[PDB]
Amino acid sequence: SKTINIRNANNFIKACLIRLYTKRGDSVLDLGCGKGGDLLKYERAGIGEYYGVDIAEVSINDARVRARNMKRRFKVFFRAQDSYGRHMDLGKEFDVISSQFSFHYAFSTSESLDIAQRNIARHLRPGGYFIMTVPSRDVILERYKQGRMSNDFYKIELEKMEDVPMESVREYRFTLLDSVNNCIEYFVDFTRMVDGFKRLGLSLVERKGFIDFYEDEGRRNPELSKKMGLGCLTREESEVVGIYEVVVFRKL
Template sequence: MTNQDDKKRPYSAEDEEEAFAQMLALAESQEQPQVKSEEPSTKNLRANNSEAVAYDTVQSLSKAEQVAQHYNTRRELGVEGRMHTKITGLRTFNNWVKTVLINENTTPGCKVLDLGCGKGGDLRKWAYARIGEYVGMDIAQVSVLQAENRYKEMRSPSFSASFFAQDCYGEPLEKTIRPPNYQADIVSAQFCLHYAFESEAKVKQMLHNVSSHLRSGGKFIFTVPDANWLVKMMRTKNSETFGNSVYQVKFAQREPITCYGFAYDFTLDEAVEDCTEYLVHMPSFVSLAETYGLKLVYKQGFHHFYGEKITVKKNLDLIFKMRVVDETRPEISAHEWEAIGIYLAVVFEKE
């Protein structure tokens, strides 16, 4: 699900204009930097031999309507624009995480249901994973049309695709998706699931939508802010507001922390400004998900995800192919690295 105006919402799948194929092509034509096999440091990702590298929308609108309005009015930075911003390292690193997460949980020919597909920013990633069928859904109709156009512009796409505009958290998918009983092998929700935590009812509707359209043995994969990390930072800093030059988090209150509807405002430089988000209380979510037949099989913060996955050569190669670091930008800044630590990569499996 996607949310709020050009500078209003947290980082999402559509916040980077996908240049995935272009990145790969560029990388293949260039000599790759040499990286030692020793375990890399995760303090600051480097490309050298020693380390592997809206809120002013109309207040009368419902939250869902604000989400749609945001995505329907976002401007496009373009490929080059997104590769030369203050948070380029963060954007490309998050792209790398999603690519690895997708590659490790898909099989050739599988069916994918992408909740919060935005403008189709992850289509190239799914093509790279050689899926067979794709269904993209998002609350913003204009974004869905752009995603569909992006798919049509792909050269000989290896998978079929269909797109639907709908609130994936507030309504049953059967209202729009065709066929109504569509079953996927993978359900994906990238940088958007936390919006469901506005209320328990929305979380339950979201889980119903995932479970009822995911086959037995299928995977539910998503990336989401880490509530434990956010609350720990608030308490460590002894302040409702914290951050650095890249991001800022502002809680309205410290206590009591509730399982649903515990809001904070999030700002990400050049991308988001004072967007209202909600803590995802993971223990409660895991317990509730089990009642929908969904079992947690993987949960890791992005820093540890990097340290774990970078030991696999193909994942390390992707760091360079996707230009997470390169000769012109040899490392991710310390402030970006701190902001990257906000997020979790999570996988559930349908029983």
């Protein structure tokens, strides 16, 4: 409702992320695609093929209808399945595998993380990119040490402490207005993710806070910036957009 500028910012930042790593007629695999909110962006990027996967049958069926009644000049494939937990094989190699605000679920257990990493490596084409957006642990924990753990929009609560240091917590409860609620999420063990990928041939090629990314593409794109309801956000809204960060791995 009021969390609009944030939805617009996160959508803007996502659109710019897609625009930086995709080319024409590209093959895109959207992990945890939800109700297909990135379609419109991919259409602009002028991609030739879109395959959306998401564990929730309801999310897919809702995603099917969007492409079913939207203006797109590319093929759409949807299949409901756990892309992070259970083994997945679509029998294809995409140019771009995207994972927006979900990869963190692939950190339920150290085993789940391994499966989700091999599923990506397997389907990614040599030289293809895997872009993603996830909450920043470093950020989240540094705000905890202070006191900024919430505001008028969001609210993050850390887990208990049974003989464990603040560096032992592996999950947190997230709350957002007009959406997420007491939704527990696992922290993204960055080093662990980077190490796991390295072994599979994927190297980290990018990492930057949502705000440093936001105010960077905003100046490079004086056009796109306006075409989409953007601008600058109040400190309260900038507090939420700061939790996240862009991370990109490339297949070599």
